[PDB]
Design an enzyme around this catalytic site. Structure first.
Site, PDB file in Angstrom:
ATOM      1  CB  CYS A  46     -22.601  61.875 -36.572  1.00 39.63           C
ATOM      2  SG  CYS A  46     -22.652  63.054 -38.028  1.00 39.63           S
ATOM      3  CB  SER A  48     -19.828  62.645 -40.796  1.00 42.71           C
ATOM      4  OG  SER A  48     -20.748  63.871 -41.205  1.00 42.71           O
ATOM      5  CG  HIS A  51     -20.742  60.141 -44.960  1.00 42.25           C
ATOM      6  ND1 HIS A  51     -21.823  59.502 -45.607  1.00 42.25           N
ATOM      7  CD2 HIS A  51     -21.339  61.390 -44.917  1.00 42.25           C
ATOM      8  CE1 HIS A  51     -22.831  60.218 -45.722  1.00 42.25           C
ATOM      9  NE2 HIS A  51     -22.379  61.294 -45.247  1.00 42.25           N
ATOM     10  CG  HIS A  67     -17.391  63.717 -35.743  1.00 41.94           C
ATOM     11  ND1 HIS A  67     -17.851  62.399 -36.381  1.00 41.94           N
ATOM     12  CD2 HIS A  67     -18.339  64.423 -36.160  1.00 41.94           C
ATOM     13  CE1 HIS A  67     -19.072  62.497 -36.846  1.00 41.94           C
ATOM     14  NE2 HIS A  67     -19.358  63.816 -36.842  1.00 41.94           N
ATOM     15  CB  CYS A 174     -21.358  66.224 -34.563  1.00 41.05           C
ATOM     16  SG  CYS A 174     -21.578  66.623 -36.171  1.00 41.05           S
TER      17      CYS A 174
HETATM   18  N1  NAJ Z   1     -22.050  70.212 -42.246  1.00 39.14           N
HETATM   19  C1  NAJ Z   1     -21.903  69.582 -41.212  1.00 39.14           C
HETATM   20  O1  NAJ Z   1     -21.142  69.991 -40.373  1.00 39.14           O
HETATM   21  C2  NAJ Z   1     -22.351  68.313 -40.846  1.00 39.14           C
HETATM   22  C3  NAJ Z   1     -22.539  67.894 -39.626  1.00 39.14           C
HETATM   23  C4  NAJ Z   1     -23.079  66.589 -39.330  1.00 39.14           C
HETATM   24  C5  NAJ Z   1     -23.551  65.891 -40.184  1.00 39.14           C
HETATM   25  N2  NAJ Z   1     -23.490  66.370 -41.618  1.00 39.14           N
HETATM   26  C6  NAJ Z   1     -24.222  65.469 -42.815  1.00 39.14           C
HETATM   27  O2  NAJ Z   1     -25.380  65.858 -42.681  1.00 39.14           O
HETATM   28  C7  NAJ Z   1     -25.929  64.692 -43.239  1.00 39.14           C
HETATM   29  C8  NAJ Z   1     -27.276  64.046 -42.345  1.00 39.14           C
HETATM   30  O3  NAJ Z   1     -26.554  63.380 -41.114  1.00 39.14           O
HETATM   31  P1  NAJ Z   1     -27.292  62.452 -39.975  1.00 39.14           P
HETATM   32  O4  NAJ Z   1     -28.626  63.617 -39.855  1.00 39.14           O
HETATM   33  O5  NAJ Z   1     -26.472  62.212 -39.169  1.00 39.14           O
HETATM   34  O6  NAJ Z   1     -27.866  61.463 -41.106  1.00 39.14           O
HETATM   35  P2  NAJ Z   1     -28.969  60.466 -40.936  1.00 39.14           P
HETATM   36  O7  NAJ Z   1     -29.580  60.128 -39.894  1.00 39.14           O
HETATM   37  O8  NAJ Z   1     -28.549  59.431 -42.018  1.00 39.14           O
HETATM   38  O9  NAJ Z   1     -30.073  61.053 -41.718  1.00 39.14           O
HETATM   39  C9  NAJ Z   1     -30.336  61.341 -43.267  1.00 39.14           C
HETATM   40  C10 NAJ Z   1     -31.864  61.198 -43.724  1.00 39.14           C
HETATM   41  O10 NAJ Z   1     -31.733  61.529 -45.028  1.00 39.14           O
HETATM   42  C11 NAJ Z   1     -32.953  60.830 -45.456  1.00 39.14           C
HETATM   43  N3  NAJ Z   1     -32.743  60.483 -46.941  1.00 39.14           N
HETATM   44  C12 NAJ Z   1     -32.023  59.707 -47.533  1.00 39.14           C
HETATM   45  N4  NAJ Z   1     -31.974  59.801 -48.952  1.00 39.14           N
HETATM   46  C13 NAJ Z   1     -33.007  60.626 -49.129  1.00 39.14           C
HETATM   47  C14 NAJ Z   1     -33.721  61.330 -50.355  1.00 39.14           C
HETATM   48  N5  NAJ Z   1     -33.086  61.025 -51.599  1.00 39.14           N
HETATM   49  N6  NAJ Z   1     -34.568  62.264 -50.119  1.00 39.14           N
HETATM   50  C15 NAJ Z   1     -35.027  62.553 -48.950  1.00 39.14           C
HETATM   51  N7  NAJ Z   1     -34.570  62.111 -47.768  1.00 39.14           N
HETATM   52  C16 NAJ Z   1     -33.403  61.185 -47.908  1.00 39.14           C
HETATM   53  C17 NAJ Z   1     -32.759  59.128 -44.813  1.00 39.14           C
HETATM   54  O11 NAJ Z   1     -33.897  58.511 -44.781  1.00 39.14           O
HETATM   55  C18 NAJ Z   1     -32.618  60.153 -43.373  1.00 39.14           C
HETATM   56  O12 NAJ Z   1     -33.667  60.114 -42.374  1.00 39.14           O
HETATM   57  C19 NAJ Z   1     -24.746  63.545 -43.462  1.00 39.14           C
HETATM   58  O13 NAJ Z   1     -24.343  63.695 -44.907  1.00 39.14           O
HETATM   59  C20 NAJ Z   1     -23.534  64.065 -42.662  1.00 39.14           C
HETATM   60  O14 NAJ Z   1     -22.424  63.643 -43.312  1.00 39.14           O
HETATM   61  C21 NAJ Z   1     -22.838  67.662 -41.559  1.00 39.14           C
HETATM   62 ZN    ZN Z   2     -21.022  64.735 -37.457  1.00 35.01          ZN
END
Ligand code: NAJ
Ligand code: ZN
Ligand code: NAJ
Ligand code: ZN
Ligand code: ZN
Ligand code: ZN
Lengths: 374, 374
Positions: A46, A48, A51, A67, A174
């Site tokens: 993920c 995160s 991160h 996770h 997740c």
């Molecule tokens: N709230 C929760 O419980 C929770 C759970 C899981 C993930 N997250 C977060 O959700 C986010 C996405 O996770 P993921 O899907 O695994 O990540 P990921 O697979 O990195 O997807 C993020 C997407 O954002 C795109 N991106 C980056 N910058 C930009 C921009 N400026 N404009 C538009 N698109 C952009 C990027 O190209 C990618 O396809 C991350 O910040 C995670 O930490 C939160």
């Molecule tokens: Zn996650």
């Protein structure tokens, strides 16, 4: 036999920020009262977890991250009543203690026993079950799934269907549940509505899946990586836009496309600027915007509160708003009953030993979910 | 005797920011198609009228302000169907055109014909009905109630009960409905909940009235003016706190008082810092915060989006979320049936000619609502 004994096993240890994971032998203590030791079967990568590497998400180091996972109970401590040795389980990075004011609230899920707000990197009792090279190693979100074995508190594990394919249902730990619930439970997307989804990674695709399940008429995917657009359309996006292709700010573009703003928007990236853009692009009087992306540590956004005074709703959520231990078994049962698909999220399947290659695939923009198999 | 004729009358003209109103003769043109000319009977002094004076709420000058009022129709323009001469009416500072996407939406109330988001200070047709000293004078929010006569668009007026006491029900044109609806309709306060209300002026007292009507168990009033506390308790506050009395920030105080955060908070002041404080003091997983106060023109707040990611909901609203033309007559009918009280809000009565004394009373902290009689 391992019950009551220290296990020596392989894990991916993160010794400091911005370094590869170190795949090496750790010692995993046996479970204490109300704890569960799990043999890992599969874990997803993920954003995160990345991160933690990048210092976007602060948690004590050194750490065993991970996770989003599934495995099989190896042993239980005294007093455990909810799982038994041999059970398939999903670790719950958001616990469900069942006793706190959040767990008792009909709409709360961010249990006060979580280790996300104010990360300690321990078990509930404030200690660690991990050592490596004679050093204590922190837990992550009460899960620590980048290890052949982990120990979790009982409130941080759910029993799931014995016939579950763990290499798929790990995503219910997740990314799938987060995105899908952010649409169907947190936003409560309506039939016929227009949605905008910022970020088309594993979580954003799961948001699209939920918006389509809720009957949205239009689902506009937004990503700066146009390679993400084909799969977004496959899972329900009706159109995709790259902000880099436009002279105007994308909130203006999306407001024009939606004839005055979208019904529901989702920030699924983790950037302050896209959180404000996503709020702005929802209709000013009745629009709803949900923050899903984890923001960078200790940074504040700037916004004009007139965006809210006109009538917008802004909210965020952890784990799609799902009460974790109640919801995870039902989500697995729903997957087994073909109510939703997980394969569209899975682009790569690697042995656990290839964890760094899995993170490189994410960072390069080339993967959605890599599943690591033990 | 005046239908189709220009009316010369007295109005309170604001020629300059931060100056007294000038009570002087204006010319009020007759109503054009789908316009209504109203002989004003009573108008309240709302803090938003003062915001025009102070430059907090930017609208073009010179202007006839006033938006919380009641009167009697003097004449109707061609094609008006919803009021007649002699009807009691309340001007609607939030119109209800009935045709735009917001008016058609079940939740929406911030009609796209409003003059609040980007004020022009005109009638719907982009012109003014007011002349003073031979110079055109702007309208305010389509209402301009600080005048013996005003002209409004038909979508900005509601017919009310012929037996209405106009010196009371004028408050349904802004402060009562705003506060009450912010509680009952926008927040949807629940029975047994804990609420925090920031700002104990006419609007905040109306929020308290709504929280009590909704069955809240605890209603914590927050004001830096302790003189406001007695009336707040009379209308339902269970306790009142002055942030100046405490060493710690009031969000920490309120979180401790509510054993981990309130269910519902309301910002009813108009400060960026209290909007963030009000969000923070609601429970992090399931709390709701509503912005009611008008922020200073063009200024952005700073906040940590982790406040939302944990599960908080943040929203704002104009006019309590009420669809104005549908809702105002029903609120008047409910007032006539004693379903809520308006007298607690009315602390002073003055003739219209003493409008500046009425603003002095508001600025000194002494008044809640002064009602001006024509
Ligand atoms: N709230 C929760 O419980 C929770 C759970 C899981 C993930 N997250 C977060 O959700 C986010 C996405 O996770 P993921 O899907 O695994 O990540 P990921 O697979 O990195 O997807 C993020 C997407 O954002 C795109 N991106 C980056 N910058 C930009 C921009 N400026 N404009 C538009 N698109 C952009 C990027 O190209 C990618 O396809 C991350 O910040 C995670 O930490 C939160
Ligand atoms: Zn996650
Ligand atoms: N959203 C809407 O449709 C709408 C409608 C009506 C009024 N308003 C706004 O709502 C706000 C309240 O209006 P009102 O009730 O007429 O005003 P008011 O009578 O001036 O009441 C504001 C109260 O805030 C108190 N106050 C000032 N600073 C602080 C502080 N730092 N902490 C706590 N209390 C403080 C102050 O003592 C006073 O009792 C104003 O900004 C109006 O412009 C908005
Ligand atoms: Zn709990
Ligand atoms: Zn309208
Ligand atoms: Zn007002």
């Amino acid at each position: 036999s391992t019950a009551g004994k220290v296990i020596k096993c392989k894990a991916a240890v993160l010794w400091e920020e911005k370094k590869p994971f170190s795949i090496e032998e750790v010692e995993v203590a046996p479970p204490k009262a109300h704890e569960v030791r799990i043999k890992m079967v599969a874990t997803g990568i993920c954003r995160s977890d990345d991160h933690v590497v990048s210092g976007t998400l602060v948690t004590p180091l050194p750490v065993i991250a991970g996770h989003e996972a599934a495995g099989i109970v190896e042993s239980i401590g005294e007093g455990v009543t909810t799982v038994r040795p041999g059970d398939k389980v999903i670790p719950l990075f958001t616990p469900q203690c069942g006793k706190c004011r959040v767990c008792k609230h009909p709409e709360g899920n961010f249990c006060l026993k979580n280790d996300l707000s104010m990360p300690r990197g321990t078990m509930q009792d404030g200690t660690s079950r991990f050592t490596c090279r004679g050093k204590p190693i922190h837990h992550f979100l009460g899960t620590s799934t980048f290890s052949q074995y982990t120990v979790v508190d009982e409130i941080s594990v759910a029993k799931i269907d014995a016939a579950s394919p763990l290499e798929k249902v790990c995503l219910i730990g997740c990314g799938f549940s987060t995105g899908y619930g952010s649409a169907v439970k947190v936003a409560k997307v309506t039939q016929g509505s227009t949605c905008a989804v910022f970020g088309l990674g594993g979580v954003g695709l799961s948001v699209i899946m939920g918006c389509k399940a809720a009957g949205a008429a239009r689902i506009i995917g937004v990503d700066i990586n146009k390679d993400k657009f084909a799969k977004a359309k496959e899972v329900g996006a009706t159109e995709c836009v790259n902000p880099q292709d436009y002279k105007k700010p994308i909130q203006e573009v999306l407001t024009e496309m939606s004839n005055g703003g979208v019904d529901f928007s989702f920030e699924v990236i983790g950037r302050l600027d896209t959180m404000v853009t996503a709020l702005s692009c929802c209709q000013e009087a009745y629009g709803v915007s949900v923050i899903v992306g984890v923001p960078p540590d200790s940074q504040n956004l700037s916004m004009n509160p007139m965006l809210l005074l006109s009538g917008r709703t802004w909210k965020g959520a952890i784990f799609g708003g799902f009460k974790s231990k109640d919801s995870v078994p039902k989500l697995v049962a729903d997957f087994m009953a073909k109510k939703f698909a997980l394969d569209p999220l899975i682009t790569h399947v690697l042995p656990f030993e290839k964890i760094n290659e899995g993170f490189d695939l994410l960072r390069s923009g080339e993967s959605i979910r890599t599943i690591l198999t033990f």
